[PDB]
From Swiss-Prot:
Protein's name in the database: Protease 3C
Superkingdom to which the source organism belongs: Viruses
Domain Peptidase C3: 2-180
Lineage of the species this protein comes from: Viruses, Riboviria, Orthornavirae, Pisuviricota, Pisoniviricetes
Stated role: Major viral protease that mediates proteolytic processing of the polyprotein. Cleaves host EIF5B, contributing to host translation shutoff. Also cleaves host PABPC1, contributing to host translation shutoff. Binds and inhibits host IFIH1/MDA5, thereby inhibiting the type-I IFN production and the establishment of the antiviral state. Cleaves host MAP3K7/TAK1, resulting in inhibition of TRAF6-triggered NF-kappa-B induction. Cleaves host TICAM1; this interaction allows the virus to disrupt host TLR3 signaling. Cleaves host IRF7, resulting in inhibition of type-I IFN production.
Source organism of this protein record: Human enterovirus D68
Subcellular location: Host cytoplasm
Oligomer status and interactors: Interacts with host IFIH1/MDA5; this interaction inhibits host IFIH1.
Reactions that this protein is recorded to catalyse: Selective cleavage of Gln-|-Gly bond in the poliovirus polyprotein. In other picornavirus reactions Glu may be substituted for Gln, and Ser or Thr for Gly
Catalytic-site annotation from UniProt: 41 (for protease 3c activity), 72 (for protease 3c activity), 148 (for protease 3c activity)
Length: 182
């Protein structure tokens, strides 16, 4: 509907797949080469479904900060025959607050879904489902089951992936450029 939705759509149309684990269907952001991200609570194993195709997982790393605190991001390398467009230049270098963000989801349950969530706070610490978690972004939108893995963007930046909600607020894990240096 406007330039925020434009950037979000450009990311969804080229840099997302539908990932299925034993724990559900998730929006999955492809970042570069065969490397993607998914919430750690997806419990990625040796095999994952990517757009309903059985796919070997070549590597999976559940990120933690240097205090050994959960970040809720798992980086997955997929045994896929095709690379993602490289979007690493759209990732923030530092923790930050943002204005006028969009949360975008693409699953069987919620195809082509875009939500203007407004102001995004650097919230920091969250007890997420009982697990101490760091680098949490917060937005004041009543997000629901089915939106985990959803991409949070501003114009020109891919800033996080949706990992939870409390009924009134939604929470995303930050994406930082330093997670994807190779």
């Amino acid at each position: 509907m406007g330039p925020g939705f434009d950037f979000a759509q450009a990311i969804m149309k080229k840099n997302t797949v539908i990932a299925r684990t034993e724990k559900g269907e998730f929006t999955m952001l492809g970042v570069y080469d065969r490397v993607a991200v998914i919430p750690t609570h997806a419990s990625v194993g040796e095999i994952i479904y990517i757009n309903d195709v059985e796919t070997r997982v070549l590597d999976a790393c559940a990120l933690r900060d240097l205090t050994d605190t959960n970040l809720e991001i798992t980086i997955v390398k997929l045994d896929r025959n095709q690379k993602f467009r490289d979007i690493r230049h759209f990732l923030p270098r530092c923790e930050d607050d943002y204005n006028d963000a969009v949360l975008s989801v693409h699953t069987s349950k919620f195809p082509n879904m875009y939500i203007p969530v407004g102001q995004v706070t650097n919230y920091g610490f969250l007890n997420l489902g009982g697990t101490p978690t760091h680098r949490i972004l917060m937005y004041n939108f009543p997000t629901r089951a089915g939106q985990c893995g959803g991409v949070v963007t501003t114009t020109g930046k891919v800033i996080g992936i949706h990992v939870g909600g409390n009924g009134a607020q939604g929470f995303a894990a930050m994406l930082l450029h330093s997670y994807f240096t190779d």
